[PDB]
Amino acid sequence: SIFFSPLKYLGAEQQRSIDASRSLLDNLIPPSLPQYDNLAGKLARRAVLTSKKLVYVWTENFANVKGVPMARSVPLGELPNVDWLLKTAGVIVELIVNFVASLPASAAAQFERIAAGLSGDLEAARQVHEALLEEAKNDPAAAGSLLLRFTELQTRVIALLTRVGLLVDDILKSASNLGLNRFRAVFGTLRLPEVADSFRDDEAFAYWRVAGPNPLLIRRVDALPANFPLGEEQFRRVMGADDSLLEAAASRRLYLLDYAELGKLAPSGAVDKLLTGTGFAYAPIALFALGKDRAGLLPVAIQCGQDPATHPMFVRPAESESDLYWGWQMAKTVVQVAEENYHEMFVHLAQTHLVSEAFCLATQRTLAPSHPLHVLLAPHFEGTLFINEGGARILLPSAGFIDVMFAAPIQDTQATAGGNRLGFDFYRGMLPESLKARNVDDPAALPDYPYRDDGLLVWNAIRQWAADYVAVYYASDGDVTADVELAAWVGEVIGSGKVAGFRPITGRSQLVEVLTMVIFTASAQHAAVNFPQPSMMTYAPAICAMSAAPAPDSPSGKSEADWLKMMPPTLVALEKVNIYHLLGSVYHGRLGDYRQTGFPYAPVFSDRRVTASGGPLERFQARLKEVEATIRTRNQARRKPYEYLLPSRIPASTNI
Template sequence: MVGTLGIPALSANSAPPFDLPMPFGDPAGPGTVNPLLPQYDPNPAGRAAELGRRQSKYVWTETANYVQGVPMAAALSIEDNPTLEWFTMAIDQQYQVVSNILVALTKHFSHLVGDLLQPLVDQLSGLKGTIDSVVRTVAPILENPVAYPLDPVARAGEYLALQTGETVLRTLDQIRDGLFAALRQMFNSPGLGNFGTADGVERYLQLYATLPVPAIADRIHEDMDFARMRVAGPNPMVLRHVHGTMPANFPLDNEGYQSVMGSGDSLGAAISQGRLYLIDYAELGSAASESATYKLLTGPGYNTAPMAAFAVPADGGELQPVAIQCGQDPEKHVMFLRPGSGDADRYWGWQMAKTVVHTADFNHHEWFSHLGRTHLVSEAFCVATRRHLAANHPLSVLLTPHYEGSLFINNVATYLILAPEATGDLIFASELQYSIDAAGRARLDWDFYEMMPPNEFAERGVDDRHLRYPYRDDALLIWDVIHDWVVDYVHTYYLSDDDVRDDFELAAWADEIAQVGKVKGFKRIDSVDQLADVVAMIIFTASAQHSAVNFPQRDFMEFMPYYSGMMAAPAPTDIAGHAESDWMRMLPCLLTSIAQMYVLDTLGSIHYRPLGDYRTNTFPFANAIDDPRIVGAGGPLDRFRAALRNAEDTINDRNSRREPYTYLLPSGIPTSTNI
């Protein structure tokens, strides 16, 4: 869930208990291997000894830092460290976002910050030359990694880059800590709470001093964009088809429906024709208590569990919003119906209701769809693979690049986002432990087979293609490409179902994932076809699914007037009579806004190693897969990469005929959950 070592840690208790690691992988790491199923390996004793060493190195825990009850790795190994390339990208991104915040505060909010930040500005300016020197040192190494180990000058450059890079990241961390310390000192200054009320959205725009303003800033009140977030936004996994009747606790009637969709349509027709959809955030539980949560640094924060209805018009077209209820109980929460273009009296109440939905969606996205159902899921498979599939097991060879960076990212996240008074505490309304518990529930409730894309879309009733649904269409395309690649790969090594059943490492791996890793629905594998489904799902989750929920954060979720993790005022209770100032009072304070920008701009900015890139994380970054049966000309890997290029062309063609959806373009999907 984090992209660098520079996520704000605002208390001494939240500092990671480890030094900055070497970012270059294990210099004594394994070279190329001859992939063999264990039942055919002529050296079973050596293989067992290797697995024994790995099992002593990778140990499960359910008390990993602040995440309780979720199986994770108790500690990391050197092979889990980032690469030189990732390290350089992280430094560059950290500099950009820290620089932007400092420039914005000193330029536009000098009446608040005074001279508090000038030493930090000076420190950051002095750091720029050091960063440039690291980039200059690293560039030739990355351009010619094969020659690098043979060049003593380049070897010296590696260690210089390491030492300098550690200094740069530590300095960036110090600047960041100083920034948030200054903001804490200013917390009671006028204008910090509800700081946008006086000047409207302009105050939030002023936070973008050197970073580009997200394009959505020009359309934050557009109803069609609000609907589009359900099918092409950061969290497009909540929308469900309404079957039969409306839920009892969402009393939308025909009169209300027709007031929005017109007298030529009806609620009954929309339901019977499969054109009515619902989003429901009841799953948030205690992370959406509705009452205020008071925090020292951010004041009162609110979040609820709203419900909202959407419909496709009778004559077809894009999904449209119909109605919003700002909580689960209709006795307490009125029904907001989308107003017509001339209905000024209900306009701002409707905007407030949409903000309630986006706040809930932000919380559900980060804790459920993002952290719980990509990061923590991939961790379970990574740990089990390290422990039970030998380095020369064909599945270990294939899957290891799809775990690259995952354990490191997750470990850093637990300290720098989930710790008390760290960014999670600043961004979200609920008590942090409630949110962390929600993420844990999301991970443990995630059912492996049910969540395979074809099954998941069918279960939500959104597999009917009359619904224009970019995420679904592109996800299924990428799923098919990955699945075809995996079928090619596994059939190279497993010539029959008996080969699967006789693979005792695979059996131990599956048992541990199900029983110790607590992946719901997981079970032993009995056939080659089932194995292909399983491996495709692991790869899809670590790459494409994570990409779909991660990269929209920068484009949509970092712009606070559109999406935020908390509201500064409660949900509206009156349909009409609101003004823009009422809506503005719901938006987060300066400290929350800066923390949100800091984290989400970082997360949405680093695209590292695209899908189809199978290299090790050890210099000189040799191919992780070198079996001629796989990598030979015209072989499975060539076919996979060609299919990815074709999928890119298909999505680009789709984007020429729809509002562009880019988050599943193969060139932008990282191979692993490394950010």
């Protein structure tokens, strides 16, 4: 049929090239609020939004994450560009080569030729990338026509990653078939993280609470909870004869970790799995204290569960107390098991990735491409829909990485992470509110808290940027409430996005706070909780989301053998070292850059009022450079550098 004529030669590659070029053409349209657009503009933007709703589609029945608002599928223009594809393929291929090289030669035989070919093709692809960028710099006038060759390279790297996918599945099909030496052996040629040397140290263990992957749970305590019955004699055994619970509470020196919210991620008993044997996890309570000099936090006491009737109190022992040493190491391991569950499922997956999913969808469906807030927000969602589909499909099915690495049955893990996302309150989850609610917002009381102090620098810089940008387009609160696209966006965020606590936006100040939280969550918050993975979470003895043995049943009389029984099977350690290396090794885009991350790396902003010398954008960029210098200076004085919130290391979006 002559009506099939358009379909005869049309493929995904042509369509991607068309999308890529049309994006550049649409970036030049000057942005406007709907009520200030002309009638032709109102008509065109309404038509485009209606079309966008065909391809950006909400579902709450996405595979392996039921109940969580998700994109039904990833639109063509939301696949990662070739810069992200090469970086990620590079990391995965290198990890495969490293793994295969550690297998016995007879086992490696199944994979080594295929991995060598992938490694060769990847090097070829990088050479092409370098050469295309060489040609663009040599003949800038013809750079528009090079976009097509970049699109062709994208096709090639997509195909390579598809073949990597098959190889990884072939490896996992044979996983089973394929005393701390084993936890080093799984690294192969990779260097062990610094935590491997320090993990037994009590002060190191405490520092995780303020400078680790989960800086969000620690809170000041003024009176101990009824279900944590620590006595004064016990407290003085650790803190000295001239201290007391009363004195330490009054002087703001007591801090509590309580993992009650883990729910079914802390199974009530043993969970037996075919691939990993018998596994346990916990919802413990731990007390930390500052010395009177506030030099640093010290762990005082640990109860390995919520009910003191069934969980005895473990109190930090003196160095001489050899009979109490191993029970204490076991109690610390219990807390670290709770930590990987809480961090990965709640702080990372639920509260960054799965929140940003909803703001991405709302933004594409309700704010027109010519809306200044679409222009501002879209760079902060680059690669988000893609990486989250990856999470749901690759990491969360039965026998996948999360079923292996986390103790709970996979259905309970899926449901509990989902429930956490649905319960997460947007306003209460903002950094300054989080700090205030937990009473850890005062540097006099708790001086060494790098997440707070570096985090507030970035939060406030973003806030001032959102204020400057809003002020370009919205002259009054009436302009906010007159914006029909913003009102629709809020409607979808509440109704389809199910973001708890979200509310109508009725003025400029509130709009600024909302935008600050959206941008911070997409960029800095994700960076702070994602990029510690390779340096802090790759070594199983320092942290793992399952234990192979129950919590210690008594503080006294444990041996090294008792503690070793908690260590996970080698398969768990193998999946752990590889996934956490990958997820923290891809830095794609940078907060404040505001250029496309794919060729031709054009400016995000065309409006002269935004891009003016010394204007809103330049003020944000210069502020981030000051923040960078400030943090570098702080890290010279810190016991350990905390680098995760350096702006040079914060991607603009959540894409890994």
